[PDB]
Design a protein around this nucleic acid. Structure first.
Length: 14
RNA sequence: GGUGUUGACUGUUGAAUCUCAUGGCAACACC
């Protein structure tokens, strides 16, 4: 999954 | 309040990565 924080791309596993 | 680190969930696609979309707080450290 790809999470997004404060308009920031976060890559977390699937 | 600013900076850094960590992380769950919906759709489509395709096929171990990458890009796009959803939600929106929490924890720890430093100044």
């Amino acid at each position: 999954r790809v999470r997004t924080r404060g308009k920031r791309r976060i890559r977390r596993x699937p």
